[PDB]
Amino acid sequence: GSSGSSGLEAVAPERPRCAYCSAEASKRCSRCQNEWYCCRECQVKHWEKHGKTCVLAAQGDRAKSGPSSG
Numbered sequence: 615g616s617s618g619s620s621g622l623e624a625v626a627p628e629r630p631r632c633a634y635c636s637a638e639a640s641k642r643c644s645r646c647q648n649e650w651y652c653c654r655e656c657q658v659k660h661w662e663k664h665g666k667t668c669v670l671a672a673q674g675d676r677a678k679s680g681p682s683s684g
């Protein structure tokens with residue numbers, strides 16, 4: 615009996631959040647698209663810092679999706 619393999623750790627992903635109020639982000643920076651925020655209110659506030667991180671980045675790889683309505 616010569617065996618020994620183990621590495622199937624299961625972990626669930628976490629939803630995005632704001633950077634100022636860590637509140638429901640469900641939004642993306644309309645400048646770099648590499649940040650999350652609840653509303654423009656915070657975006658402006660935490661802009662002095664984020665700014666540096668924000669770098670002109672055009673849209674790249676897009677995912678597939680399709681919402682619905684009731």
Ligand SMILES: [Zn+2]
Nearest residue numbers: 632635652656
């Ligand atoms: Zn916020």
Ligand SMILES: [Zn+2]
Nearest residue numbers: 643645646668
């Ligand atoms: Zn940005």
